[PDB]
Symmetry: D2
Subunit: 480 residues, 4 copies
């Protein structure tokens, strides 16, 4: 029997006579949850409630915002396994990775609780020249207002947290539209926020609707900010239709990694390349898509990496030992199988995997795939790694940048000048030194260059986009 969930409209749980949206177990492909489908009126009413709640949200004391975020931390810790099991069920990700996501979410809210009592301003001298004699200023930051949040399926809890936690830390009311396939994680967050008394009424609304019903999340003038996490083409089109509001875009990536050395050793290096290339079956925005290995290490790395790929346990995501579960859908898995076949037909040498069994697709390693192939050009978002050899370091950095994406890059080096050359010249938001590009700390500035997006997430950075600058220009204040 499927579990009946509630949606959140103006901080309140609702179900009423709304039609049901089915949420399937991505492994068994059977309906495990029933979620109420929100209407156009529900969205319009949620936006009006957020506008009405904006003065009360802005009026809250720093300690009140802190108390709200600390209560979320407490409840997440208390419902840890329940959330992890739900995460695995609705996304198809292994249980160890689902537990990791709950731990990261706890850290996200904890950082936000600490940052809520730290929104500093400036006292600025304004008597920079003779005509400005007797002028001083106070620069303070104020909430932007109602926030529109649109999140993807791959991290249905932590990527919602990277939007929700900064909004509460600042005092911004919001309306969240989670991914239809993975809404449960966002709804459990709504269940936690609902029973917090310090959070004013209408501060939040969580409405899981399909993309053809969620147009207001983009265009509506009542939102002062749109924060989107998802695919590049969808995001860029949303920015174009957004109107006057500010925009934050967390989009796709085609992440490369340079291996110039083994740091600290070969076993650890391969263990981190495996993580980058196949964490969550490569269904990550910072998945290590491309691997560039120096010629003197090429054969030793190729042998060790391929052997480690073949050793990866694929199956039921509920099992502890499972490294990679199934893809979000059979359709997604078919697309990866097609792109692997095309890459091989275009000149690529298939080292391992490439075969499909329903929603399951084998961990794949393809050598020397040309730029004309979709597997090299476009974001794969699958358990596929593209192997390349290089002889000159400068040319490898140029190859890393030979993409329309620019999220993160990785570099394995014991060399001081190579490490800083890569930091200077890699056209990304984040350069990972002596780890794969798949590394993210929740406090770091995270975001992309080029088609990977605009602006930065990471709690204190996301809070900045949710804050507007105001200056009090004071003329001879203190003159009796």
């Amino acid at each position: 029997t499927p579990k009946k969930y509630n949606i959140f409209l103006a901080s309140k749980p609702v179900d009423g006579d709304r039609k049901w949206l089915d949420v399937t177990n991505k492994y068994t492909n059977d309906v495990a949850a029933k979620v109420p489908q929100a209407t156009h009126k529900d969205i319009d009413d949620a936006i009006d409630a957020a506008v009405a709640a904006a003065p009360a949200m802005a009026a809250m004391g720093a300690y009140e915002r802190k108390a709200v975020l600390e209560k979320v931390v407490a409840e997440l810790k208390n419902r840890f396994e329940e959330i992890a099991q739900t995460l695995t069920m609705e996304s198809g990700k292994p249980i160890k990775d689902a537990r990791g996501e709950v731990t990261r979410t706890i850290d996200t809210f904890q950082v936000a609780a600490e940052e809520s009592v730290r929104i500093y301003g400036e006292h600025i001298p304004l008597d920079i020249s003779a005509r400005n004699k007797g002028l001083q200023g106070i620069v303070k930051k104020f909430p932007i207002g109602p926030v529109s949040m649109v999140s993807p399926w791959n991290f249905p809890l932590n990527l919602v947290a990277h939007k929700v936690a900064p909004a509460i830390a600042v005092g911004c009311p919001f309306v969240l539209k989670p991914a239809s396939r993975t809404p449960l994680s966002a709804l459990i967050l709504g269940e936690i926020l609902h029973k917090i008394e310090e959070l004013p009424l209408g501060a939040f609304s969580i409405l899981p609707v399909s993309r053809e019903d969620a147009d207001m999340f983009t265009v509506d003038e009542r939102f002062k900010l749109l924060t989107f996490t998802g695919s590049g083409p969808i995001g860029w089109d949303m920015k174009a239709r957004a109107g006057k509001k500010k925009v934050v875009m967390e989009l796709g990536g085609n992440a490369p990694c340079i291996v110039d050395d083994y740091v600290p050793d070969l076993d650890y290096t391969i263990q981190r390349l495996i993580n980058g290339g196949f964490y969550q079956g490569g269904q990550s925005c910072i998945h290590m898509q491309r691997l560039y290995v120096h010629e003197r290490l090429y054969d030793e790395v190729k042998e060790g990496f391929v052997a480690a790929v073949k050793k990866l346990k694929m199956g039921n995501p509920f099992e502890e030992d499972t490294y990679l579960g199934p893809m979000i859908s059979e359709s997604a898995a078919k697309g990866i199988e097609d792109w692997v076949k095309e890459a091989v037909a275009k000149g690529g040498k298939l080292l391992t995997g490439g075969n499909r069994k329903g929603a399951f697709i084998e961990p794949t390693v393809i050598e020397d795939v040309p730029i004309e192939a979709n597997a090299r050009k476009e974001e794969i978002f699958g358990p596929v790694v593209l192997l390349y050899k290089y002889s000159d370091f400068k040319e490898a950095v140029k190859e890393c940048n030979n993409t329309h994406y620019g999220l993160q890059s990785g570099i394995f080096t014991k060399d001081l000048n190579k490490a800083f050359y890569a930091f200077e010249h890699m056209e990304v938001g984040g350069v990972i030194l002596n780890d794969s590009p798949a590394l993210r700390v929740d406090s770091q500035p995270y975001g992309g260059l080029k088609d990977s997006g605009i602006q930065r997430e990471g709690v204190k950075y996301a809070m900045d986009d949710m804050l507007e600058t105001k200056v009090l220009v004071m003329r001879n204040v203190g003159t009796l």
Copy 2:
């Protein structure tokens, strides 16, 4: 006499060739005083390609090189002070006092930038926030965004170009600037200064004064990583909608209000600042004090003193030292102000002074109790018109100040501690001016609007931030032997 022939800038070099001429008129005599080469579609496309090609060299410059470029601009602006001021007055119609003031403001803008170019700090961040993240540390640095598209208005043809150009050089961003067709000379004199600086790489700048019908690329072209616009609200918001992937900075219009709750320090000084706010540059300012709210107990005393000071304002030739207000940018603009004054009076407003038009010249006007349905109250007037209102409750006056689709700046005259900070907290603007009119701006302050007045902030260190992208180096056990 004979008009002065100017040169346009394409990939850091002056050009004229066989291009057709664009006439620049003396806004007072209405006679052609300058001839500017008209840039083509190919000229714009070539300027954008040169900026893309110059981006690696611009990014490779040392901080001292960027500072040296900006300090050379400061030196040359000081040396050509009167020449620039006379040109400014001629092409815009603003009095020489207000023009000299703009050159001084521009010198400070480049000077602030020179100092900020050697102060782009980064962070060393601990990343071992939890057990999972043991042995992690980070270096956060800021890098130039890339080619910048600049579109500037007519009213401050030098200082508002400086607020874009100076941060771009301070950061190391190549740019393509499209100044206003009516006022391009100020931007072209900047090009003449920049052209002589050897430290600034080739293709770092291009200054192409083209009409709005030809400047579509400045908005839509994917080769620009940022579009920074200063101008009218409807034009700006539409440019943001057509901009594509690039980041956007919007410095748009305003309907600035001012509360007079006390005389600070005295009545004479208060009136002197209110006059400045209401009639500096004949209200052809984005921070022009369009609305004046005076507490009932001071109302009659302020109304008498203010109106008497308005009637005493010297209007005429902007080249004369004593001239407080010159003509509007065009006769068409002056006619529109005359129409809105007439409509405001017909809708119930009480005309206290002015309201009459003599060609491009429009008398300093003060209209009492104009309703919200009138265009003079609803929309940005951008003329020498001040709307007078009385209030009894301070909280309600702040609510009235916020009763606009604009939100650039507001002003407040108060001796009260709690009123000063209540206004700072509740005024829906980018800047609250305390014991001065909303018409005050310091070139180092964060400047920009809320609502329809825009997005993002200018003021050198703030504009530089929009021209910089954040990059983090995440270090795993760096320093472990």
Copy 3:
């Protein structure tokens, strides 16, 4: 029967064959606790253990320091009433004020836990001129090393916390010498720290010794910093004998308060002046010693204030209703009685109190006391308030500054320019606007000017004095 406590030597509880130091109930004057007396060898061994523990303390991860501080927060909350009762017993302060001190201590450690994961550095460009081409720098902060801490009797928990919490937040080993009369609060802290596994061995030592045995805390070259909280003459002499080490001095005060308006009303104003003048029987460093009231409000304030002073409940500090308990000693109470008598003999008009009953001394208000009197010149540290009338605001600010102290000042004003004139011209570390000078937030920079001290406490500010700056000057790093 008195409770037998343990002292802390190299993180370990010790008692052995050490002689006992008696701790009396400051109300009943009967021995309620027995504390082991530390020897010269104990102090020398504690300093050697701190030197030996400095590398391990410096090697700790930010999250480990955070975990230590969060465990202190948890334990303080769990032993709340026990600590409060102990605080009241050993100091003589009312129970409501003892509870307030435990709450402030919890906030101090909580701020320190948050600040431990926020020790930021800078990336600085160093190519400021042509000769410096290709230079860049990384500025980082490192622990100073072993810290010597000497704390007073009046806040035996929170003032120890304002030293201990920043030391742990930074990773500095320490040796604490609490006040002999009030050591229990510091020893309960030692009991909490002892059972924390993440804190290395030898990180702390709490040795309650008399002033004639604690010379090493001042002079010993093994300490890199001396942080003292206590009386001016003792502190200044300790700075003179300190040697090479850095010094932090939190000393006495003669705090004034200007009443130019009633903010928001007269009742609230008097309620805050009462707090300032008689919180903890004026036995505070920020006690409102001097009150300057504008002539137009003088009589209305004088009447309302005196009536509120006479209404104050004095007695058993264990009783809930008690506003002020007894003085630390009968000797201290006698000294206050002598200074009140002298102030009246020198021309002062006694409005209320002035009488002594053992260790108890009545809340006193003395009008127009001359500068030659000890009650006006020197820090009173008693329930005595000196009332003065003024006609000109500028002259009142000049009178506020007419002292050799400079800790905090207070100002009640509705005037914008008076508020900022006072901020600009009051020669203090803190100006309290629309509250008495007796207000302190644990996150604010706190300290004095003139004889009131040097440096600033308040968690993030105290951490700075416990950190040394190091720059990595990089020449063409990133050049292949």
Copy 4:
């Protein structure tokens, strides 16, 4: 010829009167080249009273006024460049190349200060961290500390005075400067520049070059709120002990080591920087590379190349362009270095080059494997002597670098990422120089020592911090109507 008569500064004015003369010798010819008035006990007492009296006016100055003062110093230093450089060489004995370099460094120090004077930022802090603190907010501002006592050494008589004087003016602190008796002219030329600046209040400065026996007040006097000293360790530490209540800044000696683990970018450049480190100003520097640690695999190649470069160094008249090293400050100082070289060799050290003395001149010396018991290894040499050592393990070389009671700067030549950051983490110094000798200093960097090398940091923005006191305005429900 005839000696040049100089004037001392007392309460911003030049004075000579009937005061006895102090002779200043040309450190190369050993002949009297200048006559300086000797300040009295009353002169010092009067200078301190004038600084106390000038503190309110100094604190009242606008940020633009302080910047204007510093920019006028920059202009005058540029205008008198060669004159100052020649004076510097004459009174100190340093080569003209090193003197010109010091004037350029001083120009940058005042320029950094001019920019920092208009950038003293404060904070707006939320204080409602808990329920108890509801409605609390704070404004944290920094205010001048008050009168500053300055004591400077002989080796950099201009730049080290600038590192005290420039931050004091940038903040608005009056001061009394006691420069070294042997090198006072550089400080007196600064006084001549300052005296002509109208924006700087009267009594803001006094420059009194007196002998150490007469300058006790500079240490003990309670009218000074800060003592900033640059000089020898034993003198400084004793001054800190006698200072009383005032804050103290100590810039003392060093025994700087350098690790050569790789050639960066090549061997020639590495040797060129090691020579700079070991013999710039004949080792009469606080960041002189006294100790050189070379990895065993590079040892012989470096030892041969370094010794050959030492023998090629031009020693002689500091007024000559080609001169790398001039004479020591005195013949007495040179004799002491000769004695310590002789002792180092007698204790087991292998003399590779130099070690011979010709009056005030001492040959550039390189001594191999000198034991810890020798004075040349234990104590600061402050001469043209470099102690060569071989190492096999990097971790042990860092431990050897730290095997000193000093801790100013260290140097490291490495291409290795983890070695570079291991050294940054574990070197017990204020500054770690990566791919240069420890003798590198940028005037904007935080500069100072650990252990016996001092307390606090110089570098303009860091020195300003020690000259500023923190004040918080704690606001209870400000903005509540």
